[PDB]
Amino acid sequence: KFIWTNHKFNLSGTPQQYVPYSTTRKKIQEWVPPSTPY
Amino acid sequence: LGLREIRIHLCQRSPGSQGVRDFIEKRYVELKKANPDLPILIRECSDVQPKLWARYAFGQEKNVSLNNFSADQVTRALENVLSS
Amino acid sequence: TRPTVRPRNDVAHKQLSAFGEYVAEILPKYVQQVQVSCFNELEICIHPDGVIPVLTFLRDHSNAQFKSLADLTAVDIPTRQNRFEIVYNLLSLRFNSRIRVKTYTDELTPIESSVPVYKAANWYEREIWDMFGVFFANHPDLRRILTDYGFEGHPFRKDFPLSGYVELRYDDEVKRVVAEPVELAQEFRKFDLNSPWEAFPAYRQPPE
Amino acid sequence: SNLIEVFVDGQSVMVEPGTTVLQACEKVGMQIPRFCYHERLSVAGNCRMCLVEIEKAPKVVAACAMPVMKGWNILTNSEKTKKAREGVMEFLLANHPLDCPICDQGGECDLQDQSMMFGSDRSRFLEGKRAVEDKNIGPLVKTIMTRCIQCTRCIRFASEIAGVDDLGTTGRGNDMQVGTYIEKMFMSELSGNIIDICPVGALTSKPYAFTARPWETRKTESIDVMDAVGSNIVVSTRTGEVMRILPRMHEDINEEWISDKTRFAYDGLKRQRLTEPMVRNEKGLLTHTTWEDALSRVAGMLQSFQGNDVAAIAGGLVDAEALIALKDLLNRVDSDTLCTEEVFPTAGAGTDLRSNYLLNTTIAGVEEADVVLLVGTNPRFEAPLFNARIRKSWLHNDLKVALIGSPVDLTYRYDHLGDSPKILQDIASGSHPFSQVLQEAKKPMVILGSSALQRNDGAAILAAVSNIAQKIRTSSGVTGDWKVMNILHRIASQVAALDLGYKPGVEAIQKNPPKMLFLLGADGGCITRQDLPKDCFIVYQGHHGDVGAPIADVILPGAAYTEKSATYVNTEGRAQQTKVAVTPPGLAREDWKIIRALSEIAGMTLPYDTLDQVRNRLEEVSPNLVRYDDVEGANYFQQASELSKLVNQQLLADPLVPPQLTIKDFYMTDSISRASQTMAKCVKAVTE
Amino acid sequence: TSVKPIFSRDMNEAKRRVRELYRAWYREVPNTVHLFQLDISVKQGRDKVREMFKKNAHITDPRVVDLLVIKGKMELEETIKVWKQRTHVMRFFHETEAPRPKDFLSKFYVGHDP
Amino acid sequence: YRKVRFVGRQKEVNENFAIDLIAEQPVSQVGSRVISCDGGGGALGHPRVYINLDKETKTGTCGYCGLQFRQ
Amino acid sequence: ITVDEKLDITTITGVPEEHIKTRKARIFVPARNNMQSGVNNTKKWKMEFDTRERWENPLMGWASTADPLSNLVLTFSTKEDAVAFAEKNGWSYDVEERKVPKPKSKSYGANFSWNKRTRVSTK
Numbered sequence A: 001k002f003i004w005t006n007h008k009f010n011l012s013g014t015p016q017q018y019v020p021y022s023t024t025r026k027k028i029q030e031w032v033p034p035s036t037p038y
Numbered sequence B: 001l002g003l004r005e006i007r008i009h010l011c012q013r014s015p016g017s018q019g020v021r022d023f024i025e026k027r028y029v030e031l032k033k034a035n036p037d038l039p040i041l042i043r044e045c046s047d048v049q050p051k052l053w054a055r056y057a058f059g060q061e062k063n064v065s066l067n068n069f070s071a072d073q074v075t076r077a078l079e080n081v082l083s084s
Numbered sequence C: 001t002r003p004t005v006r007p008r009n010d011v012a013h014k015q016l017s018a019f020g021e022y023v024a025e026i027l028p029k030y031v032q033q034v035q036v037s038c039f040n041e042l043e044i045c046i047h048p049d050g051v052i053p054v055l056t057f058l059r060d061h062s063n064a065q066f067k068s069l070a071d072l073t074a075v076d077i078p079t080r081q082n083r084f085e086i087v088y089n090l091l092s093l094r095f096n097s098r099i100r101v102k103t104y105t106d107e108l109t110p111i112e113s114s115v116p117v118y119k120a121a122n123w124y125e126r127e128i129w130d131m132f133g134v135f136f137a138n139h140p141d142l143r144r145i146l147t148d149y150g151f152e153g154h155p156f157r158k159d160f161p162l163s164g165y166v167e168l169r170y171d172d173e174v175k176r177v178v179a180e181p182v183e184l185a186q187e188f189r190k191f192d193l194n195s196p197w198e199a200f201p202a203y204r205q206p207p208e
Numbered sequence D: 001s002n003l004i005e006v007f008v009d010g011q012s013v014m015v016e017p018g019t020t021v022l023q024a025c026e027k028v029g030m031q032i033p034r035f036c037y038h039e040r041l042s043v044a045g046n047c048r049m050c051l052v053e054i055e056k057a058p059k060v061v062a063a064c065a066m067p068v069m070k071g072w073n074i075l076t077n078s079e080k081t082k083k084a085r086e087g088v089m090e091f092l093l094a095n096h097p098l099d100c101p102i103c104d105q106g107g108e109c110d111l112q113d114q115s116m117m118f119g120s121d122r123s124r125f126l127e128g129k130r131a132v133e134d135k136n137i138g139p140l141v142k143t144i145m146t147r148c149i150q151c152t153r154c155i156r157f158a159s160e161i162a163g164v165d166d167l168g169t170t171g172r173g174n175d176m177q178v179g180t181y182i183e184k185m186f187m188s189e190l191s192g193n194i195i196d197i198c199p200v201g202a203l204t205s206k207p208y209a210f211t212a213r214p215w216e217t218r219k220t221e222s223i224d225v226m227d228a229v230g231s232n233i234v235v236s237t238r239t240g241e242v243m244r245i246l247p248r249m250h251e252d253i254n255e256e257w258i259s260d261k262t263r264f265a266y267d268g269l270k271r272q273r274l275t276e277p278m279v280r281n282e283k284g285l286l287t288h289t290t291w292e293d294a295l296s297r298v299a300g301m302l303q304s305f306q307g308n309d310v311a312a313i314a315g316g317l318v319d320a321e322a323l324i325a326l327k328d329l330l331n332r333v334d335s336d337t338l339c340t341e342e343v344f345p346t347a348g349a350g351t352d353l354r355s356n357y358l359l360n361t362t363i364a365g366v367e368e369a370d371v372v373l374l375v376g377t378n379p380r381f382e383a384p385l386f387n388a389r390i391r392k393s394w395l396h397n398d399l400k401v402a403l404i405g406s407p408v409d410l411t412y413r414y415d416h417l418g419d420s421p422k423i424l425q426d427i428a429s430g431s432h433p434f435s436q437v438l439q440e441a442k443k444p445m446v447i448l449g450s451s452a453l454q455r456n457d458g459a460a461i462l463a464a465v466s467n468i469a470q471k472i473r474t475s476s477g478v479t480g481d482w483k484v485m486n487i488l489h490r491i492a493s494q495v496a497a498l499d500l501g502y503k504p505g506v507e508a509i510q511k512n513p514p515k516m517l518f519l520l521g522a523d524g525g526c527i528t529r530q531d532l533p534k535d536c537f538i539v540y541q542g543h544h545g546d547v548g549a550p551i552a553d554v555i556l557p558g559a560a561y562t563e564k565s566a567t568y569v570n571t572e573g574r575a576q577q578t579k580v581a582v583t584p585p586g587l588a589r590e591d592w593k594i595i596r597a598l599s600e601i602a603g604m605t606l607p608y609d610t611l612d613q614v615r616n617r618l619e620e621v622s623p624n625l626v627r628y629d630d631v632e633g634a635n636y637f638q639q640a641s642e643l644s645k646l647v648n649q650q651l652l653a654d655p656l657v658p659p660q661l662t663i664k665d666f667y668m669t670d671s672i673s674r675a676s677q678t679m680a681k682c683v684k685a686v687t688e
Numbered sequence E: 001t002s003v004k005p006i007f008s009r010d011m012n013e014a015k016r017r018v019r020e021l022y023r024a025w026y027r028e029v030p031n032t033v034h035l036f037q038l039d040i041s042v043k044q045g046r047d048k049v050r051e052m053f054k055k056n057a058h059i060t061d062p063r064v065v066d067l068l069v070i071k072g073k074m075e076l077e078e079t080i081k082v083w084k085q086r087t088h089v090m091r092f093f094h095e096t097e098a099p100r101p102k103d104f105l106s107k108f109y110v111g112h113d114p
Numbered sequence F: 001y002r003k004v005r006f007v008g009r010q011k012e013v014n015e016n017f018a019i020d021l022i023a024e025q026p027v028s029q030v031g032s033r034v035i036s037c038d039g040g041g042g043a044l045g046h047p048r049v050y051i052n053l054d055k056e057t058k059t060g061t062c063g064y065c066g067l068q069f070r071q
Numbered sequence G: 001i002t003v004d005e006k007l008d009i010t011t012i013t014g015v016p017e018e019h020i021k022t023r024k025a026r027i028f029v030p031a032r033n034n035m036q037s038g039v040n041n042t043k044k045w046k047m048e049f050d051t052r053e054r055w056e057n058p059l060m061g062w063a064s065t066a067d068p069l070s071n072l073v074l075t076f077s078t079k080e081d082a083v084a085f086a087e088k089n090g091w092s093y094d095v096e097e098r099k100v101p102k103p104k105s106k107s108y109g110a111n112f113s114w115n116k117r118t119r120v121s122t123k
């Protein structure tokens, strides 16, 4: 287990080229303004 | 307006400035025994040319100097501005 | 101690004490220090005056040949108050030995070319003018080798931040390949490896 | 004349009769490896990793505790010593389980920078390794006791300096643990400072717990301002953010010690923070506007008001370089009536000559002092390092103590003299004793706080206590000069914010209704909008949002204490300049550069741009704020001893009480504390 | 300071020198401006030369004023010949690089803490 | 704002997650005091580390290993 | 020989660019990381400059930067020869001071005492 069944390739656009991204949680957590009341 | 404040700078040594140190002995307790409003300022050391400073008229600085004086020379040098 | 520790040899260390004893004997106008590297090599600390002179004595003699010039180089040390350093390095073909000649300097003080003594310091002196900035006078030619035509910084000295000051990139807005200030895609992380406790007692700096 | 010569490694060196081997062999530049020995603590013998080998005697001694007699030959490096230091540090690697990937000290530990350089090569054991079990103490100290080389450097410290006696040694033989027999959690100030002590990774810090190893960081020295004594700290930066902070081992203030609050409080620095300018809008609407926009909003409104109708008050941790740019600007429109948030009662002094205004005998004075009387304060939770700078000196030589009012829990044996303001007076002559004891004292000392001085009768106790200092000093009064009467503050930047000449106490606004205020104070509950007249606007300036963020007109951001090169002052009147670390987030800018770009867009344009043209101005208005860390000789309280006797005001009657009692209020006080979410974890582990 | 100077002695032969190679530059800007087939107003080429020689003005010393020369004496080797291909030259006049504010309030809206 | 980069690119992300995949393990027991945690097979796995389970009911899985472990 | 004595305070100009007058260097003795007791990381007076902004790079989060010095630490051997290299290259600077402990007086065997107040238990 924990390994595949068939296979894949190295393809140029498959459409899926995987085009990596960032894997992390946010950073500074900006402030929320207060709601409707004065 | 003025005036506003008076800052007597001095030095701890180079006794050539000692008049100021002596001026406190002479007129401070007495000089400021009146004027219970003005907040004259003794700050520490310019080490050289113990320039007296004063500030008034929207924060314009006027700096007299002193280098080597006697005791009463400065006592009369202060009312130069203080009368005005 | 024997199995893993490099076995020493004494004979090589007796002679290079002698033969170097007396080149502080016969040219005292110049040589200001000499010593023996524990591995059986010599270092002759020489004033900047003799450079053409001393080699010329080392150039020919029947007691010291030193015809083969191998490696000229430099080192640049701040907090030596005279920055740079030279190190000449010469092999004497008959007597099988290496004797290196250290001569200090600054940027402003010139040093005089060795080129008529050996013709193989022709390049090694063109280079150093590029890198560190030392200026060798009376040199048949002085030019720019190892570096591009733009570097005005003289890199290998210790003030050049590793990435130089101008990255390069080509743009099609006209037809050239032009130069815009350096903008990286990663910080070049600075790690910090220097561990405490002073593991070397023998080199222990003066007590102070 | 009283010294010995002893040859270390065949080199002569002089040593006072009664220094040990280790303090000699340091003088010539060697470290005998160390485990249980440490300077500031006491000494015991149970590491056995320093074995020096004496010359001509078959035994091998230990260089921690044993004197040095007429000259031995102290032989560090031979084939005898190297037979021991290799043979101990293969013992204490017998049980030391296979951490170091993940032991959070894994980059500094001393089972690591010994046992490569000194000592062994590989191991022969081959099977074994007890593993005991951990427990918990508090939400700081994290405890894996599987390790414990058992120097017993955490234990001799509790019974020592921070006087809380809890930790113990429970057991016999191969098995003894350390942590406490019962379940008692161990919590106090300075006792978050252990985790410098323990040489291996037994005790490691909670909030930091897993974030970064220590070869990656960047040590940029700094100074901590939440409070009087300051510090000397050192920050750290990974990616351009703060990770954790240490002490810097200054030799007077912070011996090696940093307090607890100044350590775990970096954590509310990146939490809730105002990153922009925010415009006014008329409603409860408050919105973000481009930097240029809400600058002029308040620019013109200065061209309206004039005279005392516009007054600014800055009471907080603000620097000593935004206490000029703001003073000269608001004083070049000739409107002053400005003070700080604090309250310093004044009669005939309090600015001039200062003499009573700062702590006179420095921290390093206490070490010599003999008789002490301190009143109206709980020195423990304000300036926590002036406390234990008594404690260590209360021990190690004799010292006497007395407090006035509300007996609290301190760490050492004092005695409550009396509780009321009305006790001070009768001590002028003989009554309610000491009577001669302050009188017979060779170096008396008296310490008044900022909590008691802040009463409504305040100008009396200042003048009532000064008398007893005059009472003694006029006799001799010490030897000698040896100044006596002195004060201690609890607030971060005041002695700067004051002896620049900014009048003490918030009154000058309390008499009239000035329309336009600038709040740098700012979070004290002193001035409200109800107390103000009609909606004429106050402009908040500062980094946080705590209280006074909503009640305000137009706000402007700023940089905290780690982002700006500033100048603070501690209560001996030194000058310590914090240094840049992270560059401030979003759009916020430095404070004294937000003044001059308020000036030029308005009428007057102040006479400087760069920093050095700020401090020359700091140099005119004061001489000693550019003298970094030197205590200049001044007494000058004779002439103010009499002149402050001018007014005759007498006391109130009511027992003195400090604001802080036992703990829970120590944490959330200033600004950053309040928003620090870990304090929010150790405040609820107090109540229950 | 005692060290041998390079070429000059004090300030005069030195400031005869900087006057000198000026003309080698001033006489030859343009032969290149047709040679590389680079197009500019030939007077630009005579503004830059005079823009640079006025730059380092505060120099108080020989062996500095000789040092700068040894650089300046070189360039006329490369440029009066062709060792550069159009793109080692034109880099003097920076075409692409967006302007710097250099004023105050133009900074304060773009960029942190210069 | 940031989110326009993977438009049409299908955004590789991790189908399984180990955030907790651990708790499904039949947390073991021994009947003894201290144990040897060398995991995943001899000489492939974390360095040997011995942990004490004496609490009441807990264990301790050494933190390299993760695999829920107790008596 | 052309010895030609004179005095002109050594300075050098043109090699860096605007970073001559903009910055302020600093000369300081490193403080000993306190998590460990090793005293050998002291003893050399280095220098290191001011820190300017590191921002975030909006693709990954590497913190990319300008300020091309930012990472240099030279190591000098002493103060007399410390300032030697700021003037000679001509930029502004500042100085800190070295620190070493009190003498001090510590004696085991004073820990068991008749009338003294220093008497330890469970050491």
Ligand code: SF4
Pocket: D096, D097, D098, D099, D100, D101, D102, D103, D104, D105, D106, D109, D110, D111, D112, D147, D200, D201
């Ligand atoms: S804790 Fe100290 S000893 Fe145990 S592993 Fe980490 S470093 Fe090695």
Ligand code: SF4
Pocket: D145, D147, D148, D149, D150, D151, D152, D153, D154, D155, D178, D197, D198, D199, D200, D201, D202, D203
């Ligand atoms: S913490 Fe680790 S080292 Fe410090 S005492 Fe307890 S066990 Fe020994």
Ligand code: FES
Pocket: D033, D034, D035, D036, D037, D044, D045, D046, D047, D048, D049, D050, D064, D151
């Ligand atoms: S270091 Fe030797 S006794 Fe602790």
